[PDB]
Amino acid sequence: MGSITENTSWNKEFSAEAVNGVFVLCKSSSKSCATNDLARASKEYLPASTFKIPNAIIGLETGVIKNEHQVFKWDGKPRAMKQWERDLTLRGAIQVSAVPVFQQIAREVGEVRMQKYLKKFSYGNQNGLEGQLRISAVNQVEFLESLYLNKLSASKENQLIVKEALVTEAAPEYLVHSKTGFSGVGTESNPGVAWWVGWVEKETEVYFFAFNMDIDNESKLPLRKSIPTKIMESEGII
Amino acid sequence: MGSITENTSWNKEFSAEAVNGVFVLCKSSSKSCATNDLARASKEYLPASTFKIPNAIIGLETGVIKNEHQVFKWDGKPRAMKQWERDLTLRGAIQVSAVPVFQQIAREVGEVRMQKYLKKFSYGNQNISGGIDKFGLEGQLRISAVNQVEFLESLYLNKLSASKENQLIVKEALVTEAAPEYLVHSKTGFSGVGTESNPGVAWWVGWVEKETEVYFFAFNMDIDNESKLPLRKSIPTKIMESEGII
Numbered sequence: 243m244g245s246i247t248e249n250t251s252w253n254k255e256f257s258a259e260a261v262n263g264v265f266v267l268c269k270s271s272s273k274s275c276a277t278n279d280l281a282r283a284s285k286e287y288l289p290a291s292t293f294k295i296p297n298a299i300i301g302l303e304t305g306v307i308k309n310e311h312q313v314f315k316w317d318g319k320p321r322a323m324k325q326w327e328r329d330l331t332l333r334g335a336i337q338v339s340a341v342p343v344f345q346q347i348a349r350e351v352g353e354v355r356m357q358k359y360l361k362k363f364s365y366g367n368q369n370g371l372e373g374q375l376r377i378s379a380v381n382q383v384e385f386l387e388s389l390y391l392n393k394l395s396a397s398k399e400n401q402l403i404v405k406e407a408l409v410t411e412a413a414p415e416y417l418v419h420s421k422t423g424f425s426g427v428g429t430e431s432n433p434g435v436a437w438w439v440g441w442v443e444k445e446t447e448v449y450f451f452a453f454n455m456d457i458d459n460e461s462k463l464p465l466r467k468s469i470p471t472k473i474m475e476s477e478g479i480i
Numbered sequence: 481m482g483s484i485t486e487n488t489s490w491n492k493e494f495s496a497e498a499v500n501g502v503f504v505l506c507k508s509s510s511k512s513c514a515t516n517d518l519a520r521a522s523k524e525y526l527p528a529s530t531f532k533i534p535n536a537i538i539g540l541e542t543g544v545i546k547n548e549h550q551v552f553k554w555d556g557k558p559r560a561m562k563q564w565e566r567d568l569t570l571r572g573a574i575q576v577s578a579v580p581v582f583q584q585i586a587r588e589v590g591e592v593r594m595q596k597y598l599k600k601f602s603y604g605n606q607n608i609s610g611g612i613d614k615f616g617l618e619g620q621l622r623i624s625a626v627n628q629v630e631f632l633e634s635l636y637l638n639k640l641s642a643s644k645e646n647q648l649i650v651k652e653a654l655v656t657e658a659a660p661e662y663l664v665h666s667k668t669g670f671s672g673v674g675t676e677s678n679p680g681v682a683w684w685v686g687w688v689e690k691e692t693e694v695y696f697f698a699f700n701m702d703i704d705n706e707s708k709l710p711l712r713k714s715i716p717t718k719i720m721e722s723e724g725i726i
């Protein structure tokens with residue numbers, strides 16, 4: 243966000259769970275973010291399901307998604323996960339991380355048009371067989387800020403629609419917009435990535451966060467939520 | 481639309497607690513509603529804090545509220561509730577039910593423009609007389625449950641005489657519980673207590689997004705004792721739970 247600061251005490255939470263990752267946190271009025279690893283904060287990883295955010299905005303922007311009330315009806319073919327084998331709203335599709343739904347959105351937007359929006363959005367970047375899209379935590383928090391401030395190259399309507407769909411928790415005092423990613427299990431040599439991106443609105447303040455971690459045990463996935471919670475709890479947030 | 485339908489069956493929980501109230505419930509796809517009392521459903525009551533919903537939209541439309549990231553700054557003047565003595569966002573001012581913040585908005589909106597948008601929303605009997613900004617809590621403005629539900633349907637579907645973006649802002653301001661399987665939008669209302677013949681009213685109005693479906697509700701009850709209040713939340717819940725919603 244301009245200047246990024248190291249908070250090495252955060253690493254205690256990671257080390258207690260034997261997890262290699264990075265948490266990035268930004269207070270909105272600060273225009274400067276904090277982290278546990280300076281080098282890993284700006285390091286680019288596959289967005290996985292977190293890509294469903296810029297996906298949903300382009301999908302609306304192109305008219306591929308007509309409006310917020312559009313249902314994505316199940317065609318009949320057996321999908322990879324059971325949770326996906328039902329009709330879905332926009333929030334439904336996002337929260338169950340229904341890949342096929344967004345694959346179909348991605349097809350009828352197009353590879354070139356998608357790329358045009360990703361450029362404008364400044365969402366991650368590309369790299370001679372393919373070169374998959376990767377994104378840095380620093381880029382996530384920058385991304386979500388522009389989404390929150392309504393400052394993306396999209397209508398405010400379309401940004402607002404996606405934001406409600408990103409609502410994951412709600413209490414009288416705070417509102418949590420978040421999205422999870424998981425690229426798959428990996429090895430110790432070559433690990434998968436787990437994401438949690440979002441922001442926490444509390445009081446008159448806003449905190450943007452991007453967390454990622456190496457994952458080589460199925461069982462450690464839920465840690466993508468406890469590490470960022472325990473840090474934000476002791477920071478004095480939630 | 482479709483219809484409303486008395487179902488005395490729900491009265492169970494009301495008798496259970498000696499509560500004179502009404503629930504309206506409406507399946508959106510079915511385009512139809514269901515209640516315990518057709519008579520009380522159409523009976524118009526003081527909106528109280530449920531009135532913040534319209535006031536938010538009128539405030540956004542009129543430019544009074546600049547946008548969703550507007551901060552309503554606390555001057556340092558004492559307020560009736562500890563919870564109001566802090567700076568507030570839109571969601572904040574709606575959640576803690578901050579009377580003075582919204583009273584300020586009503587006054588910057590004016591009687592004229594408050595009539596304008598309230599006419600356009602078909603909000604209640606639309607009658608705002610008496611006091612420039614008291615019409616919600618202890619004024620002349622009154623609204624039915626069915627009307628609440630009607631209004632809230634128009635909000636969900638962005639059908640109001642107000643821009644979509646302002647409609648979406650307030651819709652987010654109303655999120656009160658989020659789960660993977662469903663989302664919840666509501667406001668509470670509460671006019672006061674006691675009798676001297678005439679008892680107070682207590683509202684809970686919202687809608688629930690469950691899978692592909694969505695259920696609109698408005699609820700009110702008669703309150704003469706302060707304690708039976710949480711039943712404004714719990715009773716409508718218990719019924720939705722039985723009907724299989726949450």
Ligand SMILES: [Co+2]
Binds near residue numbers: 405419443652
């Ligand atoms: Co928000």
Ligand SMILES: [Co+2]
Binds near residue numbers: 406651663665689
């Ligand atoms: Co909603």
